[PDB]
Short mmCIF file of C-alpha atoms and ligand atoms in Angstrom, two decimals:
data_model
loop_
_atom_site.label_atom_id
_atom_site.label_comp_id
_atom_site.label_asym_id
_atom_site.label_seq_id
_atom_site.Cartn_x
_atom_site.Cartn_y
_atom_site.Cartn_z
CA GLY A 5 143.92 -72.35 -7.22
CA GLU A 6 144.72 -75.12 -4.65
CA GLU A 7 146.27 -74.11 -1.24
CA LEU A 8 147.24 -77.38 0.37
CA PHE A 9 149.22 -74.93 2.62
CA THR A 10 146.22 -73.68 4.73
CA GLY A 11 147.55 -75.53 7.83
CA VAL A 12 150.84 -77.24 8.81
CA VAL A 13 152.63 -79.49 6.18
CA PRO A 14 155.39 -82.08 6.83
CA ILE A 15 158.63 -81.69 4.81
CA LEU A 16 161.19 -84.22 3.52
CA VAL A 17 164.54 -83.02 2.08
CA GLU A 18 167.11 -85.25 0.24
CA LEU A 19 170.42 -83.90 -1.13
CA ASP A 20 173.13 -85.77 -2.97
CA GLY A 21 176.23 -83.66 -3.46
CA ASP A 22 179.72 -83.63 -5.01
CA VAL A 23 182.04 -80.63 -4.36
CA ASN A 24 185.55 -80.94 -5.95
CA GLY A 25 185.13 -84.73 -5.87
CA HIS A 26 184.10 -84.75 -2.13
CA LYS A 27 180.75 -86.58 -2.14
CA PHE A 28 178.11 -86.31 0.52
CA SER A 29 174.46 -86.89 1.31
CA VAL A 30 172.06 -84.90 3.46
CA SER A 31 168.60 -85.88 4.68
CA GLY A 32 166.16 -83.50 6.39
CA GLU A 33 162.72 -83.51 8.02
CA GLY A 34 160.33 -81.07 9.65
CA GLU A 35 157.33 -78.84 9.00
CA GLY A 36 156.20 -75.79 7.04
CA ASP A 37 153.44 -73.36 8.04
CA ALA A 38 152.71 -71.07 5.02
CA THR A 39 150.11 -68.83 6.73
CA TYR A 40 152.90 -67.61 9.09
CA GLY A 41 156.02 -67.79 6.92
CA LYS A 42 157.50 -70.51 9.13
CA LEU A 43 159.79 -73.47 8.44
CA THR A 44 161.32 -75.78 11.04
CA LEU A 45 163.82 -78.32 9.71
CA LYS A 46 166.54 -80.65 11.01
CA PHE A 47 169.18 -81.76 8.49
CA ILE A 48 171.56 -84.74 8.92
CA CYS A 49 174.74 -85.45 6.96
CA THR A 50 174.32 -89.24 6.45
CA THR A 51 177.85 -89.74 5.04
CA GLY A 52 179.68 -88.57 8.18
CA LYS A 53 181.44 -85.24 8.06
CA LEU A 54 179.97 -82.60 5.73
CA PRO A 55 182.86 -81.43 3.50
CA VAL A 56 181.39 -77.88 3.20
CA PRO A 57 179.93 -75.49 5.85
CA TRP A 58 176.24 -75.97 6.62
CA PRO A 59 175.38 -72.31 5.86
CA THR A 60 176.55 -72.71 2.24
CA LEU A 61 173.74 -75.27 1.76
CA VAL A 62 170.85 -73.53 3.54
CA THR A 63 169.51 -72.01 0.31
CA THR A 64 169.77 -75.29 -1.58
CA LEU A 65 168.08 -77.39 1.18
CA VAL A 67 161.10 -74.83 -0.28
CA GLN A 68 159.90 -71.33 -1.18
CA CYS A 69 156.31 -72.66 -1.38
CA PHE A 70 156.17 -71.95 2.40
CA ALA A 71 156.46 -68.18 1.90
CA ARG A 72 153.67 -66.06 3.46
CA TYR A 73 152.10 -64.10 0.60
CA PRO A 74 150.08 -61.16 2.08
CA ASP A 75 146.45 -60.84 0.90
CA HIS A 76 147.29 -58.11 -1.66
CA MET A 77 149.92 -60.46 -3.27
CA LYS A 78 148.19 -63.87 -3.37
CA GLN A 79 148.06 -63.63 -7.22
CA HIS A 80 151.95 -63.49 -7.25
CA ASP A 81 152.60 -66.95 -5.64
CA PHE A 82 153.99 -69.14 -8.39
CA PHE A 83 155.37 -71.68 -5.91
CA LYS A 84 152.02 -72.81 -4.38
CA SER A 85 150.28 -72.49 -7.76
CA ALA A 86 152.44 -75.36 -9.21
CA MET A 87 151.47 -77.80 -6.41
CA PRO A 88 150.77 -80.61 -6.10
CA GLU A 89 152.74 -81.75 -9.20
CA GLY A 90 155.37 -79.17 -8.12
CA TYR A 91 158.35 -77.35 -9.64
CA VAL A 92 161.92 -77.84 -10.75
CA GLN A 93 164.27 -75.37 -8.97
CA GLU A 94 167.67 -74.89 -10.64
CA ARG A 95 170.48 -72.61 -9.42
CA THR A 96 174.05 -71.58 -9.97
CA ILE A 97 175.73 -70.19 -6.85
CA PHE A 98 178.99 -68.21 -7.32
CA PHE A 99 181.11 -67.94 -4.18
CA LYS A 100 183.20 -64.79 -4.59
CA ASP A 101 186.94 -65.69 -4.97
CA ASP A 102 186.12 -69.41 -4.76
CA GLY A 103 184.14 -72.02 -6.73
CA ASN A 104 180.48 -72.50 -7.59
CA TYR A 105 177.59 -74.88 -6.92
CA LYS A 106 175.05 -75.93 -9.56
CA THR A 107 171.80 -77.44 -8.25
CA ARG A 108 168.66 -79.08 -9.65
CA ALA A 109 165.79 -79.96 -7.36
CA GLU A 110 162.23 -81.24 -7.68
CA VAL A 111 159.85 -79.87 -5.06
CA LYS A 112 156.52 -81.73 -4.97
CA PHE A 113 153.97 -83.64 -2.89
CA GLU A 114 154.28 -87.38 -2.22
CA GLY A 115 151.12 -88.18 -0.32
CA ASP A 116 150.55 -85.43 2.25
CA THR A 117 154.36 -84.66 2.62
CA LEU A 118 156.19 -81.89 0.71
CA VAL A 119 159.48 -83.24 -0.63
CA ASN A 120 162.63 -81.40 -1.89
CA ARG A 121 165.04 -83.75 -3.83
CA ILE A 122 168.33 -82.19 -4.99
CA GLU A 123 171.48 -82.96 -6.95
CA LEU A 124 174.33 -80.48 -6.28
CA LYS A 125 177.64 -80.29 -8.19
CA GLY A 126 180.47 -78.01 -6.96
CA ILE A 127 183.63 -77.24 -8.96
CA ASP A 128 186.80 -75.10 -8.85
CA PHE A 129 186.86 -74.65 -5.07
CA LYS A 130 190.10 -73.99 -3.22
CA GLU A 131 190.92 -76.88 -0.88
CA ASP A 132 191.78 -74.32 1.83
CA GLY A 133 189.37 -71.55 0.97
CA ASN A 134 186.52 -70.56 3.18
CA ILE A 135 184.24 -73.40 1.99
CA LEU A 136 186.37 -76.55 1.87
CA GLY A 137 188.50 -75.21 4.76
CA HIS A 138 185.38 -74.61 7.00
CA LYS A 139 186.07 -70.95 7.73
CA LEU A 140 182.43 -69.73 7.95
CA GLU A 141 180.55 -69.02 11.13
CA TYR A 142 177.53 -71.03 12.00
CA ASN A 143 175.04 -68.13 12.60
CA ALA A 144 172.05 -66.90 10.68
CA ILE A 145 171.66 -65.77 7.08
CA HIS A 146 169.22 -63.31 5.58
CA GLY A 147 168.39 -61.72 2.26
CA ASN A 148 165.85 -60.74 -0.29
CA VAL A 149 165.11 -63.04 -3.17
CA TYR A 150 164.15 -60.93 -6.23
CA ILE A 151 161.60 -62.73 -8.38
CA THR A 152 160.67 -61.89 -11.97
CA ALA A 153 158.40 -63.73 -14.44
CA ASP A 154 159.87 -66.01 -17.12
CA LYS A 155 156.91 -66.17 -19.47
CA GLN A 156 158.74 -68.30 -22.10
CA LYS A 157 159.19 -71.20 -19.65
CA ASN A 158 155.92 -70.60 -17.70
CA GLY A 159 157.98 -69.96 -14.61
CA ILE A 160 160.07 -67.48 -12.65
CA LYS A 161 163.66 -66.38 -12.38
CA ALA A 162 165.27 -65.07 -9.25
CA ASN A 163 168.52 -63.49 -8.29
CA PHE A 164 170.12 -62.43 -5.04
CA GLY A 165 173.42 -62.04 -3.25
CA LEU A 166 173.70 -63.86 0.05
CA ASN A 167 176.30 -62.89 2.67
CA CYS A 168 177.65 -65.32 5.33
CA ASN A 169 180.07 -64.32 8.07
CA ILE A 170 183.70 -65.56 7.75
CA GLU A 171 185.33 -66.59 11.18
CA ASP A 172 187.75 -63.58 10.97
CA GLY A 173 184.72 -61.05 11.14
CA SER A 174 184.75 -60.46 7.35
CA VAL A 175 181.86 -61.42 4.98
CA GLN A 176 181.58 -64.13 2.20
CA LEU A 177 179.39 -63.39 -0.83
CA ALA A 178 177.40 -66.15 -2.61
CA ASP A 179 175.74 -64.91 -5.83
CA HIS A 180 172.50 -66.85 -6.54
CA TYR A 181 170.99 -67.25 -10.08
CA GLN A 182 167.69 -69.16 -9.83
CA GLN A 183 165.10 -70.64 -12.27
CA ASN A 184 161.76 -72.39 -11.50
CA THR A 185 159.59 -74.26 -13.99
CA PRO A 186 156.44 -76.35 -13.27
CA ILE A 187 156.64 -80.12 -13.64
CA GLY A 188 152.98 -80.55 -14.83
CA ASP A 189 150.96 -78.81 -17.64
CA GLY A 190 148.26 -77.03 -15.55
CA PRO A 191 147.84 -73.19 -15.25
CA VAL A 192 150.28 -71.33 -12.93
CA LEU A 193 150.48 -67.82 -11.51
CA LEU A 194 153.06 -65.58 -13.27
CA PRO A 195 153.96 -62.65 -11.02
CA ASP A 196 154.81 -59.05 -11.11
CA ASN A 197 158.30 -58.25 -9.88
CA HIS A 198 158.64 -58.93 -6.18
CA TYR A 199 160.87 -60.42 -3.54
CA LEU A 200 160.88 -62.88 -0.66
CA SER A 201 162.22 -61.38 2.63
CA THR A 202 164.05 -64.33 4.12
CA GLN A 203 165.60 -64.85 7.59
CA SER A 204 167.33 -68.12 8.47
CA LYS A 205 168.39 -69.05 12.03
CA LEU A 206 170.91 -71.94 12.44
CA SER A 207 171.43 -73.92 15.64
CA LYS A 208 172.39 -77.36 17.14
CA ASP A 209 170.49 -80.14 18.97
CA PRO A 210 172.35 -81.07 22.23
CA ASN A 211 171.06 -84.73 21.78
CA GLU A 212 172.46 -85.28 18.19
CA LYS A 213 175.88 -86.90 17.65
CA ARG A 214 175.94 -86.67 13.80
CA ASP A 215 177.02 -83.58 11.82
CA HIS A 216 173.72 -81.70 11.51
CA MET A 217 171.81 -78.34 11.39
CA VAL A 218 168.56 -77.18 13.04
CA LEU A 219 166.88 -74.50 11.01
CA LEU A 220 164.25 -71.97 11.81
CA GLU A 221 163.36 -69.84 8.85
CA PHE A 222 160.90 -67.07 8.01
CA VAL A 223 160.00 -66.20 4.43
CA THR A 224 157.70 -63.27 3.61
CA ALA A 225 156.66 -62.08 0.13
CA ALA A 226 156.84 -58.32 -0.37
CA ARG A 227 156.71 -55.74 -3.15
CA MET A 228 158.14 -52.29 -2.85
CA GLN A 229 155.46 -49.52 -3.48
CA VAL A 230 156.47 -45.84 -3.08
CA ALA A 231 153.11 -45.16 -1.33
CA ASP A 232 154.43 -47.20 1.67
CA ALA A 233 157.43 -44.87 2.34
CA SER A 234 157.59 -41.35 3.79
CA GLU A 235 158.56 -38.33 1.75
CA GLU A 236 161.65 -38.30 3.98
CA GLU A 237 162.61 -41.92 3.20
CA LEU A 238 162.16 -41.39 -0.59
CA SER A 239 164.17 -38.14 -0.46
CA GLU A 240 166.99 -39.94 1.32
CA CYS A 241 167.00 -42.76 -1.23
CA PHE A 242 167.15 -40.33 -4.09
CA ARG A 243 170.15 -38.53 -2.41
CA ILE A 244 172.20 -41.73 -2.23
CA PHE A 245 171.92 -41.79 -6.04
CA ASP A 246 172.35 -37.98 -6.47
CA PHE A 247 175.72 -37.86 -4.74
CA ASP A 248 176.97 -34.68 -6.47
CA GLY A 249 173.96 -32.87 -4.87
CA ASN A 250 172.68 -31.18 -8.08
CA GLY A 251 169.11 -32.50 -7.77
CA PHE A 252 169.20 -34.96 -10.74
CA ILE A 253 170.72 -38.49 -11.24
CA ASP A 254 173.11 -38.70 -14.20
CA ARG A 255 174.48 -41.79 -15.96
CA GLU A 256 177.83 -41.83 -14.09
CA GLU A 257 176.00 -41.59 -10.75
CA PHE A 258 173.50 -44.31 -11.59
CA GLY A 259 176.34 -46.56 -12.72
CA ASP A 260 178.06 -46.55 -9.34
CA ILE A 261 174.98 -46.57 -7.08
CA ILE A 262 172.87 -49.27 -8.88
CA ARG A 263 175.90 -51.60 -8.51
CA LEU A 264 175.35 -51.41 -4.72
CA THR A 265 172.08 -53.30 -5.01
CA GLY A 266 173.82 -56.52 -6.11
CA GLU A 267 176.84 -57.69 -8.11
CA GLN A 268 174.88 -59.13 -11.01
CA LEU A 269 174.61 -56.20 -13.55
CA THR A 270 176.57 -55.71 -16.77
CA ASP A 271 177.27 -52.30 -18.38
CA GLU A 272 174.39 -53.07 -20.81
CA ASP A 273 171.89 -54.01 -18.07
CA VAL A 274 172.82 -50.66 -16.56
CA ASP A 275 172.32 -48.70 -19.89
CA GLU A 276 168.95 -50.50 -20.27
CA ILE A 277 167.57 -49.61 -16.80
CA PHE A 278 168.86 -46.00 -17.17
CA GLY A 279 167.23 -45.70 -20.63
CA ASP A 280 163.96 -47.19 -19.33
CA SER A 281 163.89 -44.91 -16.25
CA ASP A 282 164.71 -41.69 -18.16
CA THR A 283 161.22 -41.49 -19.62
CA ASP A 284 161.74 -38.06 -21.37
CA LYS A 285 165.31 -38.97 -22.70
CA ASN A 286 167.06 -35.82 -21.24
CA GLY A 287 170.11 -37.85 -19.93
CA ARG A 288 169.14 -37.36 -16.27
CA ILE A 289 166.62 -38.98 -13.88
CA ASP A 290 164.42 -36.43 -12.13
CA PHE A 291 162.63 -37.18 -8.86
CA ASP A 292 159.30 -38.40 -10.46
CA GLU A 293 161.26 -40.67 -12.86
CA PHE A 294 163.11 -41.97 -9.82
CA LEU A 295 159.85 -42.78 -8.03
CA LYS A 296 158.69 -45.04 -10.89
CA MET A 297 162.21 -46.58 -11.22
CA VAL A 298 161.98 -47.64 -7.48
CA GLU A 299 158.82 -49.69 -8.27
CA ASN A 300 160.23 -51.03 -11.57
CA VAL A 301 163.55 -52.13 -10.11
CA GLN A 302 162.57 -53.83 -6.90
CA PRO A 303 166.08 -54.01 -5.37
CA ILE A 304 166.63 -50.20 -5.18
CA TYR A 305 164.95 -49.26 -1.92
CA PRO A 306 165.24 -52.55 0.09
CA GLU A 307 168.95 -52.83 -0.76
CA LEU A 308 169.98 -49.10 -0.37
CA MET A 309 167.71 -48.13 2.57
CA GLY A 310 166.21 -51.37 4.09
CA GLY A 311 167.70 -52.18 7.51
CA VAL A 312 170.13 -49.19 7.14
CA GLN A 313 171.19 -46.47 9.63
CA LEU A 314 172.18 -43.42 7.66
CA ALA A 315 175.08 -41.24 8.76
CA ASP A 316 175.23 -37.87 7.04
CA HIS A 317 178.84 -36.60 6.84
CA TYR A 318 179.77 -32.88 6.40
CA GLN A 319 183.54 -32.49 6.07
CA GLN A 320 186.14 -29.70 5.67
CA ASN A 321 189.88 -29.83 5.09
CA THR A 322 192.31 -26.93 5.58
CA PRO A 323 196.15 -26.85 5.19
CA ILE A 324 198.22 -26.59 8.43
CA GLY A 325 201.19 -24.87 6.64
CA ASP A 326 201.18 -21.62 4.62
CA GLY A 327 202.65 -23.39 1.51
CA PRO A 328 200.89 -23.64 -1.89
CA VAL A 329 198.26 -26.39 -2.24
CA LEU A 330 196.12 -27.83 -5.04
CA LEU A 331 192.45 -26.78 -4.96
CA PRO A 332 190.65 -29.34 -7.07
CA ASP A 333 187.93 -29.38 -9.59
CA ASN A 334 184.87 -31.29 -8.56
CA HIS A 335 185.39 -35.08 -8.27
CA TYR A 336 184.94 -37.95 -5.95
CA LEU A 337 186.78 -40.69 -4.11
CA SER A 338 185.46 -44.17 -4.47
CA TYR A 339 185.76 -46.06 -1.19
CA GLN A 340 185.69 -49.82 -0.41
CA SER A 341 186.23 -51.08 3.13
CA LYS A 342 186.92 -54.52 4.70
CA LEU A 343 186.58 -54.91 8.41
CA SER A 344 188.05 -57.92 10.25
CA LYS A 345 189.48 -59.14 13.62
CA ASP A 346 192.97 -60.20 14.61
CA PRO A 347 192.41 -63.67 16.17
CA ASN A 348 195.35 -63.03 18.70
CA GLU A 349 194.32 -59.58 19.93
CA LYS A 350 192.35 -59.82 23.17
CA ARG A 351 191.35 -56.19 23.38
CA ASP A 352 188.41 -54.69 21.58
CA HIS A 353 189.73 -53.73 18.12
CA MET A 354 189.22 -53.35 14.38
CA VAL A 355 191.33 -54.32 11.38
CA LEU A 356 190.43 -51.92 8.64
CA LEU A 357 191.39 -52.36 4.94
CA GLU A 358 190.41 -49.43 2.70
CA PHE A 359 190.56 -49.25 -1.15
CA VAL A 360 190.40 -45.60 -2.30
CA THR A 361 190.56 -44.30 -5.91
CA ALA A 362 189.81 -40.83 -7.36
CA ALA A 363 187.15 -40.71 -10.16
CA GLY A 364 184.68 -38.34 -11.89
CA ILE A 365 186.84 -36.13 -14.07
CA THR A 366 186.81 -37.49 -17.65
CA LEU A 367 190.32 -37.36 -19.39
CA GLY A 368 188.17 -35.38 -21.93
CA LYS A 384 205.29 -31.63 -4.83
CA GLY A 385 204.44 -33.50 -1.58
CA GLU A 386 203.10 -36.27 -3.90
CA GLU A 387 206.74 -37.56 -3.66
CA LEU A 388 206.25 -38.55 0.03
CA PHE A 389 203.74 -41.35 -0.96
CA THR A 390 205.76 -43.12 -3.72
CA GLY A 391 206.26 -45.10 -1.05
CA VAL A 392 204.70 -47.68 1.35
CA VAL A 393 204.16 -45.25 4.35
CA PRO A 394 203.70 -46.16 8.04
CA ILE A 395 200.63 -44.72 9.82
CA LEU A 396 199.88 -43.83 13.48
CA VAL A 397 196.27 -43.17 14.52
CA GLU A 398 195.22 -41.66 17.87
CA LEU A 399 191.56 -40.87 18.72
CA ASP A 400 190.20 -39.51 21.98
CA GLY A 401 186.42 -39.49 22.25
CA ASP A 402 183.48 -38.56 24.50
CA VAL A 403 179.99 -39.77 23.44
CA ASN A 404 177.13 -38.73 25.79
CA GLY A 405 179.72 -38.49 28.58
CA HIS A 406 181.21 -41.98 27.83
CA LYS A 407 185.01 -41.47 27.40
CA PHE A 408 187.21 -43.65 25.27
CA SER A 409 190.47 -43.84 23.43
CA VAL A 410 191.60 -45.65 20.28
CA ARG A 411 195.24 -46.16 19.27
CA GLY A 412 196.31 -47.74 15.99
CA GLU A 413 199.08 -48.47 13.54
CA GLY A 414 199.45 -49.64 9.98
CA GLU A 415 200.54 -48.79 6.50
CA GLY A 416 199.30 -46.81 3.48
CA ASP A 417 200.14 -47.54 -0.15
CA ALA A 418 199.04 -44.50 -2.28
CA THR A 419 200.05 -45.93 -5.66
CA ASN A 420 197.52 -48.83 -5.17
CA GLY A 421 195.14 -46.65 -3.10
CA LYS A 422 195.31 -49.22 -0.28
CA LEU A 423 195.65 -48.75 3.47
CA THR A 424 195.63 -51.20 6.35
CA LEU A 425 195.14 -50.33 10.01
CA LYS A 426 194.79 -52.18 13.30
CA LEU A 427 192.97 -50.01 15.82
CA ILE A 428 192.76 -50.81 19.55
CA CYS A 429 190.42 -49.46 22.21
CA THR A 430 192.89 -48.68 25.06
CA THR A 431 190.08 -47.82 27.50
CA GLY A 432 188.50 -51.32 27.58
CA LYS A 433 185.19 -51.75 25.80
CA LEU A 434 184.38 -49.25 23.03
CA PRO A 435 180.98 -47.68 23.93
CA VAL A 436 180.03 -47.23 20.21
CA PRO A 437 180.18 -49.74 17.31
CA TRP A 438 183.50 -49.76 15.47
CA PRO A 439 181.87 -49.03 12.06
CA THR A 440 180.66 -45.64 13.37
CA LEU A 441 184.35 -44.62 13.67
CA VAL A 442 185.64 -45.94 10.32
CA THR A 443 185.30 -42.58 8.51
CA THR A 444 186.91 -40.72 11.45
CA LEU A 445 189.87 -43.12 11.85
CA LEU A 447 193.64 -40.80 5.54
CA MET A 448 192.40 -39.52 2.18
CA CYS A 449 196.05 -38.77 1.27
CA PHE A 450 196.31 -42.50 0.39
CA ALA A 451 193.85 -42.20 -2.48
CA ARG A 452 195.13 -43.26 -5.93
CA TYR A 453 194.66 -40.21 -8.18
CA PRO A 454 194.83 -41.26 -11.88
CA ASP A 455 197.49 -39.49 -13.97
CA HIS A 456 194.96 -37.10 -15.61
CA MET A 457 193.84 -35.97 -12.06
CA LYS A 458 197.13 -35.56 -10.17
CA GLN A 459 196.60 -31.73 -10.16
CA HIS A 460 193.32 -32.35 -8.16
CA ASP A 461 194.93 -34.06 -5.08
CA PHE A 462 194.67 -31.54 -2.29
CA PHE A 463 195.49 -34.12 0.38
CA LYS A 464 199.04 -35.02 -0.79
CA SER A 465 199.70 -31.41 -1.82
CA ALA A 466 199.47 -30.21 1.84
CA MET A 467 202.14 -32.72 3.04
CA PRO A 468 204.41 -32.74 4.88
CA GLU A 469 202.97 -30.01 7.16
CA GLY A 470 199.52 -31.64 6.59
CA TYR A 471 195.83 -30.75 6.95
CA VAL A 472 193.07 -30.31 9.48
CA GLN A 473 190.06 -32.62 8.76
CA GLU A 474 186.86 -31.60 10.56
CA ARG A 475 183.44 -33.19 10.28
CA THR A 476 179.99 -33.25 11.73
CA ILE A 477 178.31 -36.63 11.37
CA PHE A 478 174.51 -36.77 11.71
CA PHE A 479 173.10 -40.20 12.55
CA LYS A 480 169.50 -40.22 11.29
CA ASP A 481 166.99 -40.18 14.24
CA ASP A 482 169.91 -40.33 16.73
CA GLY A 483 172.80 -38.04 17.80
CA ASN A 484 175.83 -36.56 16.11
CA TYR A 485 179.62 -36.77 16.19
CA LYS A 486 181.85 -33.69 15.77
CA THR A 487 185.48 -34.45 14.92
CA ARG A 488 188.70 -32.53 14.40
CA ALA A 489 191.84 -34.26 13.22
CA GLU A 490 195.34 -33.22 12.20
CA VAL A 491 196.90 -35.40 9.50
CA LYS A 492 200.64 -34.81 9.05
CA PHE A 493 204.10 -36.32 8.85
CA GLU A 494 206.27 -36.68 11.99
CA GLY A 495 209.46 -38.17 10.57
CA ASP A 496 208.61 -40.86 8.00
CA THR A 497 205.27 -41.75 9.79
CA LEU A 498 201.93 -40.30 8.76
CA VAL A 499 199.94 -39.43 11.86
CA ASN A 500 196.17 -38.90 12.21
CA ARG A 501 195.30 -37.37 15.63
CA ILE A 502 191.60 -36.92 16.40
CA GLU A 503 189.26 -35.51 19.01
CA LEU A 504 185.64 -36.63 18.75
CA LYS A 505 182.66 -35.28 20.71
CA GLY A 506 179.26 -37.03 20.41
CA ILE A 507 175.99 -35.65 21.85
CA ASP A 508 172.25 -36.42 22.06
CA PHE A 509 172.48 -40.14 21.35
CA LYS A 510 169.72 -42.48 22.49
CA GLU A 511 170.96 -44.95 25.15
CA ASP A 512 169.18 -47.78 23.29
CA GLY A 513 169.47 -46.53 19.73
CA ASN A 514 171.56 -48.28 17.19
CA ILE A 515 174.86 -46.65 18.26
CA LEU A 516 174.90 -46.80 22.06
CA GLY A 517 172.82 -50.03 21.99
CA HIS A 518 175.34 -51.73 19.60
CA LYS A 519 172.82 -52.67 16.91
CA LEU A 520 175.08 -52.22 13.82
CA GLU A 521 176.64 -55.08 11.96
CA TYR A 522 180.33 -55.50 11.74
CA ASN A 523 180.85 -54.79 7.98
CA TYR A 524 180.96 -51.80 5.69
CA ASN A 525 179.45 -50.67 2.43
CA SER A 526 181.02 -48.84 -0.49
CA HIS A 527 180.56 -45.11 -0.85
CA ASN A 528 181.55 -42.18 -2.90
CA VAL A 529 182.88 -39.05 -1.28
CA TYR A 530 182.06 -36.02 -3.45
CA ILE A 531 184.76 -33.34 -3.08
CA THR A 532 184.52 -29.62 -4.00
CA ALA A 533 187.00 -26.76 -3.52
CA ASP A 534 186.64 -24.27 -0.67
CA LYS A 535 188.78 -21.43 -2.02
CA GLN A 536 188.02 -19.09 0.94
CA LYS A 537 189.68 -21.51 3.38
CA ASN A 538 192.34 -22.71 0.85
CA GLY A 539 190.93 -26.17 1.22
CA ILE A 540 188.18 -28.55 0.24
CA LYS A 541 184.87 -29.83 1.52
CA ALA A 542 182.72 -32.82 0.97
CA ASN A 543 179.38 -34.26 1.95
CA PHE A 544 178.34 -37.88 1.62
CA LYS A 545 175.97 -40.32 3.24
CA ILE A 546 177.29 -43.41 4.94
CA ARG A 547 175.01 -46.47 5.05
CA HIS A 548 175.42 -48.66 8.12
CA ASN A 549 173.70 -52.06 8.11
CA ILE A 550 171.53 -52.63 11.21
CA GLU A 551 171.41 -55.76 13.40
CA1 CA B 1 173.34 -35.51 -9.53
CA1 CA B 2 164.60 -37.48 -17.63
#
């Protein structure tokens, strides 16, 4: 016990850095107010031009200023180590680039809180997104998951931080953190929890040097099921239970836990599954899931926090009278990269989709997709009376389950966010493994093609109804769509444009519909809000 953080405390930050031999120094000053979770800092590069983007360094450049609510004061390791302070060490893995390693001492000198850091970066690409300065200068946010490290009298933390790339895509930085106290005195060791962190980056008009003004909020939180509605907990469970049978099995848990962060091995996954399946029946029931949400703090905040759910109900029917393949149950694993063509002036979306068939253990018109195949996409839509059109082109590569599209709004400004149309705007380009080729309805209906219909239910907002014909005209695969949307809120997340420009991974669970000579599927899409 000793909260030197009752009122407003002055901060000093000093960083000495070396990334791929490019050395630099940063100095910062400002103030922290713990009782709100508020930091205000200005940082100067004192060595001229900073050889990495400012937002890569935000996390390195004072978690002692977090606001711990009254029910969590006994979980604040950071303040408990003051005034002698703590060592903070990290490794930060930039996906498809290099890594930073950092060591800092955070402590009081007089009445000023000081963060002193050495940072070493290696194996960066000289023209990747970091050394090539291809990151936007925006705002970053995330949740820092804290667990006790009893053996060092400290804490560990892990989190994935996303920063926007200039092309509209998203750069992942995987953080592994360790804190240990400098002095010998007692410290608070916490239950599992997280810091909700928002960072706002701006410039000072009156500063010539390379620099960053930072406004940051940090709030401690701990997920408790008692703080969520039956509806919210049901939804969360259904993300996991994507085959709809009412229980979570090991294959399901595998895929869906890996959406909470990139940091889990097959063994971590076996361990959490084993610990959550309290009666050892090989499935996680609803009650077991409730306790697993408190035990594994990332589950709810990462799957459902700041997320607009979109419930998809889908049906596919052949256009021709020819024989088709009606599959056994299975799913399509989807990953999606959204970006922007820097030379297109119209409102548009570049969409890259990776699609592979899974979920059956090894335990005719396919020939048309051997084959890089050109695509045409045409959508005409009406949402709450707002008319629009999209027209696009690209290519599908079935054997790598890859497709690329550029999609243009030809009616000016698109009155809904582009991500709400991703599922509407080519399942025939899935890669079906060799043991599942007899389960690929989509290719089997080509060249005459299939009708794809859906209803999409945006939680606490309106719905889209869609009908598309997917077929070959010549050597071009064509998706033609009508969409009708009703009962949207004019300032909800769709018509108010409050959805981020990125996309999560999802599994589409497919079952046969023998009575229609087709298939159906239902899946939940998770759209990030802001
Ligand atoms: Ca299930
Ligand atoms: Ca069980």
